[PDB]
Design a protein around this nucleic acid. Structure first.
Lengths: 637, 705
RNA sequence: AGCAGAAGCAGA
């Protein structure tokens, strides 16, 4: 007899057991070496979908600019970024008609939020491309460095505290003939650059291979932007989020229970609205080259139309971000490694010296890549990337565009209606008609409409089936029963601060993963068991009666023998594990307090214990946690 | 302060202000300050429109007032009604929010409640707005500024002044005046002028066909693009089509047919540690978890015959393996582990240097030197080889899912259950552990995790030293006896791991009972000697030493430390099923799921094939199989498996749709098939998954009839 | 050698 795991699906629906097909126990793929190859591939692909557009030379930076919008309509099924402005405006106007006053209300809301916003908000972001050193650094560090640099050049807008003066200083910096900044060469130094170089650096992008991405055989590159545009992208995203919140078909921003509720409600609404005797079909789609095909100029037009009835200054403020993105420049990374096997020698060619050697010495793939990149290359090692949205960062605005595309609902008064849900690069399109052939006709019309707006539905990865079952952002729906949001369950290991706050963090993460993400009771209890095992192994504080031997474990055993009331002991001191689903949120020390005897309880709760020492407001709370300032709140060396 | 807020303002005012805040999305508790202001604003905008009405002809004093409030109501409704009035009365619509509208002058009122001087605040509001609205600024210092003469008489002005009389002092007497924030602060930033350089950037950032940004703005603001979508679609080429195609069982051809081609070499064994062929030397202990070196020393002492072997018979040699060096390294390992010294370090000798690959990395030189040189060229990347199905993977799956008389898991305890939820959780864990703990896969996973933990510790703490790391496990049989299992020994090379992907070489010498010559294709990577024989079941079974050179990085070791997560993936899975059968029944189905009851019979799952016939196993068997599948996902996980799973999920969903008679359609089936097939290169689990997918697809086709 | 897989590591 030969076992066959897939035979399980014979007796159980695939959706019910979809978790079996997710290999999340394996080591996620990781990229080795340079990311320049993938960045060049992204640049080439972005320029390929738009080469038929208008090509010119920028008069501010001297880069090569490719503009596909208002270009010739596509004639094949390949990805097309030749979006038409008129159609985008029509879609936005229709969405306005379906949502009267929504655009201006959202613009006002975002504008007032931007008034009240302060510069410190910029510190809430993730890694950002600091230009003073040209590297990815924490948002706070980049903000501090840029503020100091602006101080050196008589730009003291950030002093006012508001985000408006900071962004005003940002734009005015582009006007300075020369800029002085603090660099690291390691020691601190002052360095001066010219206006064009500063403009290029501000518009520049850092590129790196995405690591630990699941479900993708080949790696792909991702982009981090500078600190200059963070305010403008923030306000644009706030505006787009305000619009999305009021859009029924927007699969954002809430996640979890509201996600399943939205899926089910959309499905039910769609069934109910079906003409009698007709049919409803659902298309699970995936957008190929979603980032590449979208054009920043289309987003500029979107912002201009959204702020139709808003003050001129706010219109300019919204419009800045698309302008900078449309002129973005991409850094190509670390370069390429050339090796002679006979001599066992290797040498790294950085991006500026990419063409310093004849292309014959490169492999075929890199040879073709560089040959196609030549025109868009710059002497300093960066590439012009006027089209495309490599960094993303317009998830809300892109979602707005997708929803607007979904809002047409009909073409030429044909006998079919279509609606659905859109979230970033994923979507589900429901179509009702009299027969499946008409539904496919409507889906073809939707595909053409999406082509028209710069969105390319992927024919290889999308599919259609009678309404009732589908997939959306890893959420599988089948006759009401939504399977789950398949997410990488994390390592319930040692959080890594101290003895007590460690346990607090562990139990809090278990509770949150239970309450926000999908995890049932038995899974959570096994999670608690695994975390306690890892905790005891890491701190070598196994149970007092546990015959494991060790340096500290010897004194732990001595305590166990000495102890009279063993029920009230912390696992850090070899005590029994008491945590469960009920008492997940309560700190262990308070749980056991009633049980612990004074003989050891007094020592644990020593006011002037020699371990914790001087404390800080961050120390006890820093995510936040609950704990007791006992003997298990010590710090590092 | 909220308790004080409730005093001066009724519940409706407070809730309207809180809702207006809700359209701002900053914690209302964080700063009631502007809340105060807005409610005050709202309040005045209501008192100006309390008793002032108009008649059907214009009498100043029926169902129509002389004013209409905008503040407080939802922003979308406020703006829609404001636009309605603007278009009805044919008056310029303010670009800012309107606070109040008049029915006599037909103009939009703006009101501002400031702290100090009013005239300067009035001029600042004019700067913000200009003349689009009439401004009614008030200030607690009996100050006022109205831009219209007959907007309101003295009665309303006096009433509002009186209403602010309490708040000008009432806050101070109860000590609240100090922390009262102004009203201009929330609107300090109004001025925003673009520089010349940014203006040019915006100018060149216009869609094709427009001269500059001004033209684009005029076009977007003025022209009505009705019919653009239909026109463009009509003039678009028909070639741009999704190409619908109804799916049928015939279209679903087997995936990756090349795996049936016998020319390609059968996929070889590549797992880090032996999984089903492992032979653990067992030593009986009753307690202390002694040192790994001491444990290995004792285990080898028990089997001195195998330990003392020095004239091996070379059974299999790998293509690029030095048999003498491997044997010398093994003897060095055994001697070092059997010595009296606590340290387990191996001297960096010639054979050790070769096995660890000492001094193989290419030297780095300056970029200029490489550029000048001609013979230096970028090496062509190595592509994974194509391989065909191998039966050893099927044997691994079959054997590791079979129950064994051992227990490797030693999970810790938890607090007593109280509530029903923890009771059901304990029941589920009881059943799932009772099933899993007695399976070979669990022991293999424990060996993997323990070895990876030891390897990571040694690599991080002994970067510059060669170390011998015994492959050890702790097991307990059903009768309570405790054994320590020694499966083999590992030599750790230099581990100066700086990057996450830095590779450290490990030489594994693992005991086994399988003769490699039985399945030659399974062992092209393994150098196998015959080290001895053992008495087990009345037969002298040969014991071989599988010697191999492998490599791992920090990421793989860290994930190996966390291999226990496999449990979770299995547990959750089965729990879902249990939950599902609870939904159909409405009560806990765990007992019925596992052991059944008078009402519901025990559940069964189609498990595999026997003589070409489908066979069914119990719930526990399916649990164990999915657990071994998770363990396999771990041991054979890499980019190929991720890609294959991601691309085949779509085909699985299409098959499910066909089963449900949901008449699924496809748009480009060949593309999906190519995406699935390009991931099947050399990963044994991926190849076997393709084979099983083909077989199960065939069975589903047979059933569909 | 080997890890590994579109490019690296096998100390700087």
């Amino acid at each position: 007899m030969n076992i066959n795991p897939y035979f399980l699906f014979i007796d159980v629906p695939i959706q019910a057991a979809i978790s079996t097909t997710f290999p999340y126990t394996g080591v996620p793929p990781y990229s080795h070496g340079t990311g320049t190859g993938y960045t060049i591939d992204t640049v080439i692909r972005t320029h390929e979908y738009s080469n038929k557009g208008k090509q010119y030379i920028s008069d501010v930076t001297g880069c090569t600019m490719v503009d596909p919008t208002n270009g010739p309509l596509p004639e094949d099924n390949e990805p097309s970024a030749y979006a038409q402005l008129d159609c985008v405006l029509e879609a936005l106007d229709r969405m306005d008609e379906e949502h009267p006053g929504l655009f201006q209300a959202a613009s006002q809301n975002a504008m007032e939020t931007l008034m009240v916003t302060t510069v410190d908000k910029l510190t809430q972001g993730r890694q950002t491309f600091d230009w003073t050193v040209c590297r990815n650094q924490p948002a706070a560090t980049a903000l501090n460095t840029t503020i100091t640099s602006f101080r050196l050049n008589d730009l003291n807008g950030a002093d006012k505290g508001g985000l408006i003066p900071f962004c005003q200083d940002i734009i005015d910096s582009l006007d300075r003939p020369e800029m002085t900044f603090f660099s690291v060469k390691p020691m601190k130094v002052k360095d001066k650059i010219t206006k064009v170089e500063y403009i290029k650096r501000a518009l520049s992008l850092n590129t790196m291979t995405k690591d630990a991405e699941r479900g993708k055989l080949k790696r792909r590159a991702i982009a981090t932007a500078g600190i200059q545009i963070r305010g403008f992208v923030l306000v644009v995203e706030n505006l787009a989020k305000n619009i999305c919140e009021n859009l029924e078909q927007s699969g954002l921003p809430v996640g979890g229970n509201e996600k399943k509720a939205k899926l089910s409600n959309a499905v039910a609404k769609m069934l109910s609205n079906c003409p009698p005797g007709g049919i409803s079909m659902t298309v699970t789609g995936d957008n190929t080259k979603w980032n590449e095909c979208l054009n920043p100029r289309i987003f500029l037009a979107m912002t201009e139309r959204i702020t139709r009835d808003s003050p001129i200054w706010f219109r300019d403020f919204c419009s800045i971000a698309p302008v900078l993105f449309s002129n973005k420049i991409a850094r190509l990374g670390k370069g390429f490694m050339i090796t002679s096997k006979t001599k066992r020698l290797k040498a790294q060619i950085p991006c500026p010296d990419l063409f310093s050697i004849p292309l014959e010495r490169y492999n075929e793939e890199t040879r073709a890549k560089l040959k196609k990149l030549k025109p868009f290359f710059n002497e300093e090692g960066t590439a012009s990337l006027s089209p495309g949205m490599m960094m993303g960062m317009f998830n809300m605005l892109s979602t707005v565009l997708g929803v607007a595309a979904l809002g047409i609902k009909n073409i030429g008064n044909k006998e079919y209606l279509w609606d659905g849900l859109q979230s970033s690069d994923d979507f589900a399109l429901f179509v009702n008609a009299k027969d499946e052939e008409t539904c496919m006709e409507g889906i073809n019309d939707f595909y053409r409409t999406c082509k028209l707006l710069g969105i390319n539905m992927s024919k290889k990865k999308s599919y259609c089936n009678e309404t009732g079952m589908f997939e959306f952002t890893s959420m599988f729906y089948r006759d009401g029963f939504v399977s789950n949001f398949a997410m990488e369950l994390p390592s319930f290991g040692v959080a890594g601060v101290n003895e007590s706050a460690d346990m607090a963090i562990g139990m809090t993460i278990i509770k949150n993963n239970m309450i926000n993400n999908g995890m049932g009771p038995a899974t959570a209890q096994t999670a608690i068991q695994l975390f306690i095992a890892d905790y005891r192994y890491t701190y070598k504080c196994h149970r007092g009666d546990s015959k494991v031997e060790g340096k500290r474990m010897k004194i732990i055993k001595e305590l166990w023998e000495n102890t009279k009331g063993r029920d009230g002991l912390l696992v850090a001191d070899g005590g029994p594990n008491i945590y469960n689903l009920r008492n997940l949120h309560i700190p262990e020390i308070v749980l056991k307090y009633n049980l612990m005897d004074p003989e050891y309880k007094g020592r644990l709760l020593h006011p002037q214990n020699p371990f914790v020492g001087h404390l800080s407001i961050e120390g006890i709370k820093e995510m936040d946690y609950d704990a007791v300032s006992g003997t298990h709140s010590w710090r590092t060396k | 302060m909220d308790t004080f807020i409730t005093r001066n303002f009724q519940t409706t005012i407070i809730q309207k202000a809180k809702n207006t805040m809700a359209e701002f999305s900053e914690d209302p508790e964080l700063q009631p300050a502007m809340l105060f202001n807005i409610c005050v604003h709202l309040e005045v905008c209501y008192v100006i429109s309390d008793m002032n009405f108009l008649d059907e002809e214009g009498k100043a004093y029926n169902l129509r007032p002389q004013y209409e409030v905008i503040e407080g109501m939802p922003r979308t409704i406020a703006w829609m009604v404001q636009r309605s009035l603007a278009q009805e009365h044919g008056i310029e619509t303010p670009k800012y929010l309107a606070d109040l509208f008049d029915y006599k002058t037909k103009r939009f009122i703006e009101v501002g409640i400031t702290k100090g001087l009013a005239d300067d605040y009035f001029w600042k509001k004019k700067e913000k707005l200009g003349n689009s609205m009439e401004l009614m600024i008030f200030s607690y210092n009996q100050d006022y500024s109205l831009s219209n003469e007959s907007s309101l008489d003295e009665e309303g002005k006096g009433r509002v002044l009186s209403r602010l009389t309490e708040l000008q002092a009432e806050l101070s007497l109860k000590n609240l005046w100090q922390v009262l924030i102004g009203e201009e602060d929330v609107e300090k930033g109004i001025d925003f002028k673009l520089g010349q350089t940014i203006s040019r950037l915006r100018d060149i950032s216009v869609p094709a066909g427009f001269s500059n940004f001004e033209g684009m703005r005029s076009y977007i603001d003025n022209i009505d693009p009705k019919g653009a979508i239909e026109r463009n679609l009509a003039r678009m080429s028909p070639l741009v089509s999704v190409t619908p195609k109804k799916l049928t069982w015939e279209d679903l051809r087997p995936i990756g047919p090349h795996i049936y081609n016998h020319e390609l070499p059968e996929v070889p064994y590549n797992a880090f540690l032996l999984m089903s062929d492992e032979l653990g030397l067992a030593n009986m202990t009753e307690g202390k978890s002694k040192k790994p070196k001491t444990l290995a020393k004792e285990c080898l002492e028990k089997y001195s015959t195998l330990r003392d072997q020095t004239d091996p018979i070379l059974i299999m040699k790998s293509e690029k393996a030095n048999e003498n060096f491997l044997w010398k390294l093994w003897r060095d390992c055994v001697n070092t582990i059997s010595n009296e010294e606590m340290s387990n370090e191996l001297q960096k000798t010639n054979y050790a240097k070769w096995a660890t690959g000492d001094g193989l990395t290419y030297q780095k030189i300056m970029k200029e030197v490489a550029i000048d040189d001609e013979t230096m060229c970028q090496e062509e990347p190595k592509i994974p080889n194509k391989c065909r199905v191998a039966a050893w993977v099927q044997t691994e799956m079959n054997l590791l899912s079979t129950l064994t008389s051992k227990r490797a898991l030693d999970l810790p305890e938890i607090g007593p259950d109280v509530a029903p939820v923890e009771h059901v959780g304990s029941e589920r864990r009881k059943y799932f552990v009772n099933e899993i703990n007695y399976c070979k896969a669990s022991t293999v996973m424990m060996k993997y995790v323990l070895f990876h933990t030891s390897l990571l510790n040694e690599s991080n703490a002994s970067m510059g030293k060669y170390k011998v790391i015994p492959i050890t496990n702790r097991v307990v049989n059903e009768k309570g006896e405790s054994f320590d299992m020694l499966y083999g020994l590992a030599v750790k090379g230099q581990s100066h791991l700086r990057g996450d992907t830095d590779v450290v070489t490990v030489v594994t010498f693992e005991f086994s009972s399988t003769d490699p010559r039985v399945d030659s294709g399974k062992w092209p990577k393994y150098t196998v000697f015959r080290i001895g024989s053992l008495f087990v079941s009345g037969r002298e079974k040969s014991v071989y030493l599988y010697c191999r050179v492998n490599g791992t990085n920090k990421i793989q070791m860290k994930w190996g430390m966390e291999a226990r997560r496999c449990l979770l993936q299995s547990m959750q899975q089965m729990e879902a099923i249990v939950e599902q059968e609870s939904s159909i029944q409405g009560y806990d189905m765990t007992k019925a799921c596992f052991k059944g009851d008078r009402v519901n019979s025990p559940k069964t799952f189609s498990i595999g094939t026997q003589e070409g016939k489908l066979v069914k196993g119990s719930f526990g068997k399916a649990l164990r199989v999915i657990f071994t599948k998770c363990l396999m996902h771990y041991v054979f996980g890499n980019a190929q498996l991720e890609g294959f799973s991601a691309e085949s999920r779509r085909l699985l969903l299409l098959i499910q749709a066909l089963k449900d008679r949901k008449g699924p359609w496809v748009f480009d089936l060949e593309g999906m098939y190519s995406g699935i097939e390009e991931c099947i290169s050399n990963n044994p689990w991926v190849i076997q998954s393709a084979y099983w997918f083909n077989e199960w697809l065939g069975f589903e086709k047979e059933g569909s009839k």
